[PDB]
Amino acid sequence: GWTLNSAGYLLGKK
């Protein structure tokens, strides 16, 4: 699904 620090952190913020 969606990660906390792996989706919006170290990769890109939405």
Lookup result for tokens 């952190």: 9
Q: How many whole angstroms separate alpha carbon 1 and alpha carbon 10?
A: 17
**Coil, strand, or helix at residue 13?**
coil
User: Method used for this model?
Assistant: NMR
> For 6, which DSSP code?
T
Runs of H (alpha helix) within the chain = none
7 CB contacts (<8 Å, ≥6 apart)? 14
Q: How far is CA 13 from the centre of its chain?
A: 6
Residue 9 Cα distances to 1, 3, 13, angstroms: 15, 9, 6
Cα dihedral 2, 8, 6, 1 in deg (nearest 10): 10
DSSP 9: S
The residue written with tokens 């990660």 in the block is: 3
